[PDB]
């Protein structure tokens, strides 16, 4: 009924990590010229040991063999007006994360995250995307970072094939991280604990990871890893991109080696600073991780404006405030924070 339905890619060369076919879930919207393509998150692995361990304990993130044939859209993928006041009628696409590579892989464990996005788009042309006017590439966590890496690729691809009437845009949620110093230094062993900078150096070589050419050209060769960090990729992006980022992201803190005060401040403070020249943003002062596909994404507010209203104001100003960093230095100084 309102279910998004599973499709597997007709090009079987484009796969999940274990060779199973990749795919996408879709709920078509009679009428709408608006497309929402959401990239799922779920960490990553950068060497054999970590990927083997991910494969045994979090196998859904590496294979499509057990994917259910349908799933219900939630938050911004919801078709219920109460849950998704402005976007409920869009064409809804969910792209499951089965490449453990922050959607950067292009080598044909296989790491193919960038080609999966590429392939999904090509398929959707023949499903009404050909007749589309707005394409919003959204994603949470690793999927939030994957938007940054892919949004201009997706734009370029759609010109090449003869579809300049589609406007590609980005929404990066909980995907904007700092390449910073750890609280308590430690070796690059576990995914959860390895430092942000070393993790991706490892990752990019392991995944034959590719980054957007406009960021790539403007770095020394073998230095491509820099382009995983929002502040370094962003000013280079041609596509308009809205940034949703908790000031105190739980994933950020886990790789900075915190386990539940002067350090916190510095992080929270620099986040404000990295975001002061991104005009499209929504950074509530809470302790959390991800929001755009949670049903309670309508409850959060900064400066009187909800997240759904901010994105709408952002959308209106592209065809009502849009830059909204919550103003304090402490998690739980904002009464509408979740749970």
Q: Between residues 251 and 313, which has the closer beta carbon with respect to ligand MYZ?
A: 251
Residue 113 makes CB contacts below 8 A (sequence gap 6+) with 97, 99, 101, 102, 103, 104, 105, 146, 207
Stretch that binds ligand MYZ, among 54-62, 83-91, 140-148, 237-245 (CB under 6 A): 140-148
Build a one-symbol-per-residue string for 41-80: x at contacts with ligand MYZ by CB under 6 A, - elsewhere: xxx-------------------------------------
Least CB distance from residue 172 to ligand MYZ, whole Å?
10
Residue from 138, 141, 158, 171 that binds ligand MYZ (CB under 6 A)? 141
By beta-carbon proximity to ligand MYZ, the closer residue of 8 and 188 is 188
SS3 240: coil
Q: Which is nearer to ligand MYZ, 129 or 264 (CB)?
A: 264
Q: Which residues, in sequence order, are CB contacts of 99 under 8 Å at separation 6+? A: 16, 17, 22, 105, 110, 111, 112, 113, 116
CB atoms within 10 A of CB 87: 23
Helix, strand, or coil here: 24? Answer: strand
Structure tokens at 283: 């950074």
Least separation in angstroms between residue 196's CB and ligand MYZ is 4
Size of the site for ligand MYZ (CB under 6 A): 14
**Of residues 134 and 139, the one with the C-beta less far from ligand MYZ:** 139
195-254: which residues touch ligand MYZ (CB under 6 A)? 196, 200, 228, 251-252
Asked if 229 and 180 count as a contact pair (C-beta separation under 8 A), the reply is no
The span from the CA of 265 to the CA of 331, in Å, is: 10
CB of 266 to ligand MYZ, least distance (A): 16
Nearer to ligand MYZ, 228 or 242 (CB): 228
Report the alpha-carbon distance of residue 111 to residue 91 in Å, rounded. Answer: 27
Between 63 and 91, CB nearer to ligand MYZ: 63
Side-chain-side CA neighbours of 278 within 13 Å: the count stands at 30
d(CA 114, CA 220): 22
Residue 282 engages ligand MYZ in binding (rule: CB under 6 A): no
Tell me the per-residue interface mask from 117 to 136 with ligand MYZ, x by CB under 6 A, - otherwise. Answer: --------------------
Q: Which is nearer to ligand MYZ, 79 or 145 (CB)?
A: 145
| Residue 181 structure tokens | 């110093």
- In whole angstroms, give the CA distance from residue 213 to residue 224: 10
- Both structure tokens of 337: 């924070």
Q: How far is the CB of 153 from ligand MYZ (least distance, A)?
A: 16
Instruction: Find, among 175, 178, 157, the residue nearest to 166 by Cα.
Output: 157
HSE-CB of 174 using CA atoms within 13 angstroms: 28
Q: Which stretch binds ligand MYZ (CB under 6 A): 40-48, 127-135, 265-273, 317-325?
A: 40-48
Question: Shortest approach of ligand MYZ to residue 119 CB, angstroms?
Answer: 22
Give the pairing of strands 23-27 and 4-8.
antiparallel
- Smallest gap from Cβ 184 to ligand MYZ, in A, equals 16
Question: Which of 25, 88, 177, 246: binder of ligand MYZ (CB under 6 A)?
Answer: 177
Kindly state whether residue 170 participates in binding ligand MYZ, applying the rule CB under 6 A.
Answer: no
Residues in touch with ligand MYZ (CB under 6 A): 41-43, 102, 141-142, 145, 177, 196, 200, 228, 251-252, 255
């Amino acid at each position: 009924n309102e279910d998004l339905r599973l499709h597997l890619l007709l090009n079987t060369s484009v796969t999940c990590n274990d060779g199973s076919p990749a795919g996408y879930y879709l709920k078509e919207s009679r009428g709408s010229r608006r497309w929402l393509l959401f990239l799922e998150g779920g960490w990553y692995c950068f060497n054999r040991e970590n990927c083997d361990s991910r494969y045994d304990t979090m196998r859904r993130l590496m294979s499509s063999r057990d994917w259910p044939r349908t799933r219900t859209g939630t938050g911004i993928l919801s078709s219920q007006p109460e849950e998704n006041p402005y976007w409920w009628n869009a064409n809804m696409v969910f792209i499951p994360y089965c490449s453990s590579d922050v959607w950067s892989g292009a080598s044909s464990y296989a790491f193919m995250g960038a080609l999966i996005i590429q392939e999904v788009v090509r398929e959707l042309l023949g499903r009404g995307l050909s007749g589309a006017k707005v394409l919003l590439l959204a994603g949470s966590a690793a999927g939030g970072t994957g938007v940054l890496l892919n949004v201009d690729r997706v734009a370029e691809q759609l010109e090449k094939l003869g579809y300049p009437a589609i406007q590609v845009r980005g929404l990066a949620d909980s995907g904007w991280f700092l390449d910073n110093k750890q609280y308590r230094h430690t070796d690059c062993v576990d995914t959860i604990t390895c430092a942000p900078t070393e993790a991706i150096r490892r990752g990019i070589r392991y995944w034959n990871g590719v980054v957007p050419e406009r960021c790539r050209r403007q770095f020394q060769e073998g230095e491509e890893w820099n382009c995983f960090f929002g502040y370094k990729v962003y000013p280079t992006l041609r596509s308009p991109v809205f940034v949703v980022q908790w000031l105190f992201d739980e994933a950020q803190l886990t790789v900075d080696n915190v386990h539940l005060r002067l350090y916190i401040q510095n992080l929270g403070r620099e986040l404000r600073h990295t975001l002061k020249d991104v005009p499209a943003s929504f950074a509530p002062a809470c302790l959390s991780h991800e929001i755009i596909i949670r049903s309670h994404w309508t409850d959060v507010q900064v400066k009187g404006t909800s997240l759904p209203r901010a994105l709408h104001c952002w959308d209106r100003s592209l065809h009502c405030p849009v830059h909204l960093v919550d103003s304090c230095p402490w998690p739980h100084c904002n009464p509408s924070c979740p749970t």
